[PDB]
Design an enzyme around this catalytic site. Sequence first.
Site, PDB file in Angstrom:
ATOM      1  N   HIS A 112       0.881  -1.194   0.049  1.00 26.32           N
ATOM      2  CA  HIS A 112       0.015   0.027   0.031  1.00 26.32           C
ATOM      3  C   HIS A 112       1.110   1.330  -0.076  1.00 26.32           C
ATOM      4  O   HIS A 112       0.710   1.948   0.828  1.00 26.32           O
ATOM      5  CB  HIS A 112      -0.984   0.096   1.230  1.00 26.32           C
ATOM      6  CG  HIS A 112      -2.306  -0.736   1.098  1.00 26.32           C
ATOM      7  ND1 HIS A 112      -2.334  -2.157   1.390  1.00 26.32           N
ATOM      8  CD2 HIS A 112      -3.138  -0.853   0.068  1.00 26.32           C
ATOM      9  CE1 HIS A 112      -3.341  -2.717   1.220  1.00 26.32           C
ATOM     10  NE2 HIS A 112      -4.058  -1.862   0.378  1.00 26.32           N
ATOM     11  N   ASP A 159      -5.779   5.569  -0.797  1.00 21.30           N
ATOM     12  CA  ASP A 159      -4.950   4.941  -0.076  1.00 21.30           C
ATOM     13  C   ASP A 159      -3.952   5.645   0.825  1.00 21.30           C
ATOM     14  O   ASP A 159      -2.888   5.162   1.374  1.00 21.30           O
ATOM     15  CB  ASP A 159      -4.122   3.542  -0.418  1.00 21.30           C
ATOM     16  CG  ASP A 159      -5.208   2.277  -0.561  1.00 21.30           C
ATOM     17  OD1 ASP A 159      -6.101   1.945   0.327  1.00 21.30           O
ATOM     18  OD2 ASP A 159      -4.949   1.478  -1.234  1.00 21.30           O
TER      19      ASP A 159
HETATM   20  C1  EP7 Z   1     -10.036  -3.100  -2.130  1.00 22.94           C
HETATM   21  O1  EP7 Z   1      -9.752  -3.019  -1.049  1.00 22.94           O
HETATM   22  C2  EP7 Z   1      -8.582  -3.968  -0.751  1.00 22.94           C
HETATM   23  C3  EP7 Z   1      -7.771  -3.565   0.492  1.00 22.94           C
HETATM   24  C4  EP7 Z   1      -6.670  -4.500   0.564  1.00 22.94           C
HETATM   25  C5  EP7 Z   1      -6.174  -5.364  -0.278  1.00 22.94           C
HETATM   26 CL1  EP7 Z   1      -4.733  -6.210   0.258  1.00 22.94          CL
HETATM   27  C6  EP7 Z   1      -7.148  -5.629  -1.379  1.00 22.94           C
HETATM   28  C7  EP7 Z   1      -6.325  -6.495  -2.321  1.00 22.94           C
HETATM   29  N1  EP7 Z   1      -5.813  -5.827  -3.580  1.00 22.94           N
HETATM   30  N2  EP7 Z   1      -5.341  -7.118  -4.001  1.00 22.94           N
HETATM   31  C8  EP7 Z   1      -5.524  -8.295  -3.320  1.00 22.94           C
HETATM   32  C9  EP7 Z   1      -5.144  -9.760  -3.492  1.00 22.94           C
HETATM   33  C10 EP7 Z   1      -4.443 -10.092  -4.793  1.00 22.94           C
HETATM   34  N3  EP7 Z   1      -5.496 -10.498  -2.735  1.00 22.94           N
HETATM   35  C11 EP7 Z   1      -6.270 -10.152  -1.457  1.00 22.94           C
HETATM   36  C12 EP7 Z   1      -6.484 -11.009  -0.621  1.00 22.94           C
HETATM   37  C13 EP7 Z   1      -7.357 -10.710   0.587  1.00 22.94           C
HETATM   38  C14 EP7 Z   1      -7.581  -9.358   0.659  1.00 22.94           C
HETATM   39  C15 EP7 Z   1      -8.347  -8.934   1.949  1.00 22.94           C
HETATM   40  O2  EP7 Z   1      -8.500  -8.046   2.516  1.00 22.94           O
HETATM   41  N4  EP7 Z   1      -9.429  -9.926   2.307  1.00 22.94           N
HETATM   42  C16 EP7 Z   1     -10.130  -9.791   3.243  1.00 22.94           C
HETATM   43  C17 EP7 Z   1     -11.771  -9.567   2.856  1.00 22.94           C
HETATM   44  C18 EP7 Z   1     -11.872 -10.210   1.604  1.00 22.94           C
HETATM   45  C19 EP7 Z   1     -12.443 -10.799   3.872  1.00 22.94           C
HETATM   46  C20 EP7 Z   1      -7.161  -8.277  -0.227  1.00 22.94           C
HETATM   47  C21 EP7 Z   1      -6.447  -8.879  -1.481  1.00 22.94           C
HETATM   48  N5  EP7 Z   1      -6.246  -7.802  -2.191  1.00 22.94           N
HETATM   49  C22 EP7 Z   1      -8.102  -4.945  -1.662  1.00 22.94           C
HETATM   50 MG    MG Z   2      -7.779   0.779   0.444  1.00 22.60          MG
HETATM   51 ZN    ZN Z   3      -5.937   0.425  -2.827  1.00 20.98          ZN
END
Ligand code: EP7
Ligand code: MG
Ligand code: ZN
Length: 342
Positions: free
Chosen positions: A81, A122
């Site tokens: 982030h 972010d």
């Molecule tokens: C859009 O807001 C966000 C905030 C933070 C993140 Cl890291 C992401 C994000 N962007 N790419 C990814 C990838 C590749 N894998 C992820 C696997 C799990 C999660 C997560 O927070 N899971 C918890 C919920 C689903 C219960 C987020 C993931 N993610 C998006």
């Molecule tokens: Mg965010």
């Molecule tokens: Zn973001």
Amino acid sequence: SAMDDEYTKLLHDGIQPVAAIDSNFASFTYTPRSLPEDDTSMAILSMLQDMNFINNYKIDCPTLARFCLMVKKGYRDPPYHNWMHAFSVSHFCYLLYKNLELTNYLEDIEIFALFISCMCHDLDHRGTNNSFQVASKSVLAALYSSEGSVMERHHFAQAIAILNTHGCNIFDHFSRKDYQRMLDLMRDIILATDLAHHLRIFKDLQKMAEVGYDRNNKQHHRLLLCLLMTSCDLSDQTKGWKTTRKIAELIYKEFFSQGDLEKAMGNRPMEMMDREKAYIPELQISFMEHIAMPIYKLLQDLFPKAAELYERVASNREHWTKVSHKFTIRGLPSNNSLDFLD
Ligand SMILES: COc1ccc(Cl)c(-c2nnc3c(C)nc4ccc(C(=O)NCC(C)C)cc4n23)c1
Ligand SMILES: [Mg+2]
Ligand SMILES: [Zn+2]
């Protein structure tokens, strides 16, 4: 002053044409993370110019240069982030503008708000999630936990603080109504980046795509902005395997660090945050099938030209299935040693 000299050049040197950044800069196949970080603020200006926002909204160039640098400097350096995430998210917004005829769906000011929100969405992320703010009794939780979406409220507040910094308010010549509209849009779009919000509105997104987009329906504008924002946020999944692999590494580095902090507080982390339990292939395949793919399926449903995005997310997910076996240690490890069993 570092920012001083960077600003001086950003302002007085002029804005390079987007094609000079990369011949394929406006293609869905381009990976903005390939751009040297030192070139990204100039690239932001190039995109803003190419989308005609600078001219249309008569944005003051010194103010815009300062704003862009303030936003960049407003990100910390966690593994994922960070500013390069915000930059790549903003780039994807630009790609949607260049490839999908957004002006048939959204007002000019909404498309502008989307892009600025992408840059800011972010801001000042500390590499920990909403749950951790409450558990650690952070200042951010003290401010916002009663409202939910703690981090996203902080990101929005940070965006406003930058605007309220002298010399940085790129909207300060706006009519009172447009100013109010822009900040209201930034609120809605940045708060929509909470995946909890996405899951809440997912049914509504589906019904919108089912009945068909109605540009006269204000709630449809709101919903589409949420979907587009989410599509930008997750756009690393729409490139090649290498991008998905690297971004998995960055995210789990960030996640596992939080998990380590949670353990030290005597709490047990979510499985995906626990480096002793998290099985990354399963976890990525799950995220892709249950979160990323349905988002790009909806995007494809609304924009036929976005089909290639869904197909590459699906393709990337299939590649995860294919490399999963590699997480099993066959034979002896690296070093011919079983010492790690001790
Ligand atoms: C859009 O807001 C966000 C905030 C933070 C993140 Cl890291 C992401 C994000 N962007 N790419 C990814 C990838 C590749 N894998 C992820 C696997 C799990 C999660 C997560 O927070 N899971 C918890 C919920 C689903 C219960 C987020 C993931 N993610 C998006
Ligand atoms: Mg965010
Ligand atoms: Zn973001």
